[PDB]
Amino acid sequence: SLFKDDIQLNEHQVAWYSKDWTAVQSAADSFKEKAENEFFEIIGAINNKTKCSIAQKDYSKFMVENALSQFPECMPAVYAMNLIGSGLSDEAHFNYLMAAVPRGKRYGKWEDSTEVLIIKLLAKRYQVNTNDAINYKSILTKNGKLPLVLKELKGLVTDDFLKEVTKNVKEQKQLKKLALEW
Amino acid sequence: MITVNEKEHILEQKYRPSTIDECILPAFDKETFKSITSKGKIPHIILHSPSPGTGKTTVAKALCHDVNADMMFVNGSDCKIDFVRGPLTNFASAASFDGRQKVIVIDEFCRSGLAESQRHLRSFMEAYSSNCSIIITANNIDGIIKPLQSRCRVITFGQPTDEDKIEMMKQMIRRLTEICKHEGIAIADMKVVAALVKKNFPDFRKTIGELDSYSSKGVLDAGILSLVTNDRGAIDDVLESLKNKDVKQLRALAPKYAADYSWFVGKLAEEIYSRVTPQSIIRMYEIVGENNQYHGIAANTELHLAYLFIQLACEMQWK
Amino acid sequence: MKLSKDTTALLKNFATINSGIMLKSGQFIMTRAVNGTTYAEANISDVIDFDVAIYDLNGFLGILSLVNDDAEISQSEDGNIKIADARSTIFWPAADPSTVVAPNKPIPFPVASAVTEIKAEDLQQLLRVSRGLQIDTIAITVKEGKIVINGFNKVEDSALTRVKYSLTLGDYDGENTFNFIINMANMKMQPGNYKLLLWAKGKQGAAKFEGEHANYVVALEADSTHDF
Amino acid sequence: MKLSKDTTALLKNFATINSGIMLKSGQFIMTRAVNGTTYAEANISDVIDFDVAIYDLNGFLGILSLVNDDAEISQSEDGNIKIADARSTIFWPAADPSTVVAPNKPIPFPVASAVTEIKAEDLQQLLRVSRGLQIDTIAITVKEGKIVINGFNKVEDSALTRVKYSLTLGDYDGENTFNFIINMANMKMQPGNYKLLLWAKGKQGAAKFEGEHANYVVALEADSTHDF
Amino acid sequence: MKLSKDTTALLKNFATINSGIMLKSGQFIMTRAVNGTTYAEANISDVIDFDVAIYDLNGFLGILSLVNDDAEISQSEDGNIKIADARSTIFWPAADPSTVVAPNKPIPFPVASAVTEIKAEDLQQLLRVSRGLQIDTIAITVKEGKIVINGFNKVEDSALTRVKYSLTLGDYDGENTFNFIINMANMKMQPGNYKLLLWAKGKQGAAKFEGEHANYVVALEADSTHDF
DNA sequence: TTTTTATGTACTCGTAGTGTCTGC
DNA sequence: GCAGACACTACGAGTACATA
Ligand SMILES: Nc1ncnc2c1ncn2[C@@H]1O[C@H](COP(=O)(O)OP(=O)(O)O)[C@@H](O)[C@H]1O
Ligand SMILES: [Mg+2]
């Protein structure tokens, strides 16, 4: 047993002093801090006139433009970078948007799950597009039992299909959501 | 008087300092190292500076040599997970019959996908830190996970105060003098070495190398001075002709860069961003980015590049 | 001090307990399990000249298996481990004492709160099916007067309430009933059944062996039903 | 023109040195690693009748392990390598010799600065202990008047200070003191008794292993210190 | 219905052709490739009771690889497939028969335009040589009376110019000249003996492999030529 | 005061399953 | 007469990159 009144080394020492590496793996995970990442704060520097100095930060014209796509006052420069900003340097992209966005004071933010599984499930079945799939459901909600076609498609709801739309934790409350359809 | 590694031939490492007192650091940092060596045991230290060649790996080795430590030097890129659990633990748990402090230098540790090995190192520092210590030398400090900086003593290199910079450059001007004394290089003009140290400062590896490249004559006459002060070019002729609105030279420089259009347009945007006024920064990236957008659509690429030159000359308010 | 095959086999077995059992001068060997949940002790044929710490015993014996059996193992001139062979000389590094955990004291066996036994050739046949039919935690209890062993797969049985394999071994002369529930990940015996000696106190409760070669101890489990 | 299984066994060894090989007609074969690290030469029992360069010698023999040993090899009119079997035939493409880094002429090894003589089982034990002690670089030097080999763990040893092995080999009748370092990765010779020839002049150096049919020139390490 | 070892291995083979399979009452199982290039059929010893369609045949066999051989595969009272073990019980969701592309049309092979037989070790050597020689297409023609299989590198060799392997399979009797090219990719038969049946007339054709248990009908590449 | 969208490509690392070789 | 253990491959993960 435990030698009672001896000093117990920390769990790192316990795992490390044992060639049991699965516990050492648990020891390293204790410092993961992946929830404590960074992400942007360059947009805030764009509309605040702050020394961003991106270089190593993850720059995405896809994203950085689409964030200013919500604010219509920043849209003239976003419309330009959409036009001619293709093939323009990342460092140049932030530098153009520096003197291009008006004032700063970074602001707020920027179609549901149980519908979007049916829409994407009808789309793959009949090999149609989103637009066509969306209309299919809307007409099927009105007519010859959409509940019937839900059962026709209970077999091809794989976890690869599911997790592809909303990973998080829903694709398990959605996996066995459309289970009860018989 | 300078430590030489008489098997090196490469200058930039033949005269790599051996001790802290041979290193050129800011006075507080240099004092903080001499005190860390005086206290016997090395703490967990992260030496970092984004500008390379400031003294990181030298000081890391100088601390191990001053203390006379059983140093395990490792290339941080080969410091994978099976390494931290492998030869790292085997060394940390070795018997220190010698009494010298076991210290592991992980050179160039900041890396992309070494995350699992990086957190393992943190958890490793709760077990075997009783025995050994770890010196980290990195360029990007962020490439290092936050738990390590939380534990390690982070000493930022290459960020000196003004008074610290002045004394450091003066020390370096004396170093390159003692290099030229020991290598066989004649210092005909002392303003060469001063401009050598000053032009490329914080990188001490690069300025020693530049002395090697300018030692091709064996003497540092004022001609070599005119070389070091010659601010080179890249595309200095186009920037010059754009500020002067010289339509003749823009007309003759467009066939010069129509060959490598995509590089030149990118290099031109980089250079004008510094030389042009802020209200012109808007029109600059719009004129260039549009010209590059239609690159290849334009039938004559040379004339299209002259079009960029004329468009910039008329629209750029210069500094 | 050459090590024989009996010593190396017990050392190999003691390696399954601690990652690197440090040994002391004499002929007594002991290994507290990394944390403090299993113990082993044994006397063996070969004399120990020096008390050293070992780091990775399994590789150390693996290095020993490359030289002759009568390789004179000495303590190296620099304080490590010299394995003198015919032409070669392997220098196995000595370990730091603070980097491995050994028994601070060879654990005194308390007065047995209960005494029993297993068999003679059932251990080999007992642990064979025990590992085969995926059962973790094992129990020891009195039934029909006799004390028997019968565990449950705590995986598909987090609440301990099943049955898998019984073993009748002998009757229990005592007049009190209990049930201890040792974790499987703690037992690892050499061939040949030994003597099983039980013990229990308030919020403690070990359980150990006595053997022709070694004595093996295990741990308590808080939620164990004690009668003593 | 069939290849005996000892000749191919020697060929699969040469493939460790260089991923390809350029072999001309005759009984003599050779190869050198691209990084000028190792060089092997050997005369063998079979006879090659035609010059051929093989871009992937490893895959060639791995495919040649799929036809019967009586397979008749030849230069097909399909200008490659014809592997005639009892029923099947393999047309392995001959490669442009310019794409195979090979010694254009056999390396005439200079007069040895020091001569010793490793035994096959001594070499065998040296490889077994290296895989157990993570021995990556070894040094052959003088110890109390005898030529010995000492392995280290350059990863943990760095400066190469802590000795981890000592295969006492022959005796040294000269007066010179040398410390030749070889990288274990460049020990691409197959097991077998070898007469070890050492040479080093200034900042140069190489080691040669004379075999009962196969010779090997392995390169010394940057830190090799000698007084020749 | 009980699934034995030989039948699950067949289903493990039929899974490679189609990600799932549709099987109706009887002992005849059949699947076709989604694009329609490889058709496989098999009469088996295990008899299945109901009609079922499995979309994830690969995952179905993986989940079955935990239940004992007594595995009771039954239909659920609602419709799914429950797997009864000696102890545990699993529930697998069945899929609609139109989700799995079924062959549905087991029209018999016509008259064999050419007939030979390939051994088990001959198919073995073809698949093992191609693994080492990167052979992606094989063509079955006649050479000097006996018919052979030639393997090429369609990517490294546009119009199948240079052979890389040739396997003879007996002699041809009639006075016909042809060259049926089969893609090695869409050739998914399991190891064993196969009486090779070759049918082709005009611009259509196919290759049928008659195994001792199952049949594989693959398609011939368009480049194939014949004078039938 | 916010936190994500598609396709295709190339590389590294870790681990885990599979393959070829060897014992006092 | 096979196991062991190194040796090899495949794959999930994570990463960085260039496009529209
Ligand atoms: N603070 C310094 N003092 C003197 N020499 C230096 C200093 N920093 C760099 N050097 C020169 O650069 C080389 C060492 O570069 P180092 O600082 O170790 O690389 P890094 O800084 O990229 O880790 C040495 O040869 C030395 O001559
Ligand atoms: Mg460095």
Short mmCIF file of C-alpha atoms and ligand atoms in Angstrom, two decimals, chain B residues 13 16 52-53 55-58 73 107-108 137-139 205, ligand 2:
data_model
loop_
_atom_site.label_atom_id
_atom_site.label_comp_id
_atom_site.label_asym_id
_atom_site.label_seq_id
_atom_site.Cartn_x
_atom_site.Cartn_y
_atom_site.Cartn_z
CA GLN B 13 31.79 31.90 -35.36
CA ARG B 16 32.17 33.59 -30.70
CA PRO B 52 18.64 37.31 -34.95
CA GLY B 53 22.30 37.29 -33.97
CA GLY B 55 23.61 36.94 -28.37
CA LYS B 56 21.04 34.25 -27.53
CA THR B 57 22.85 31.00 -28.33
CA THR B 58 26.19 32.50 -27.27
CA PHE B 73 22.97 21.12 -26.25
CA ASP B 107 18.47 25.96 -29.24
CA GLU B 108 15.86 27.33 -31.67
CA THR B 137 16.80 30.34 -27.28
CA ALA B 138 13.98 31.40 -29.59
CA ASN B 139 13.22 34.12 -32.13
CA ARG B 205 26.38 37.81 -36.37
MG MG H 2 21.33 30.31 -32.30
#
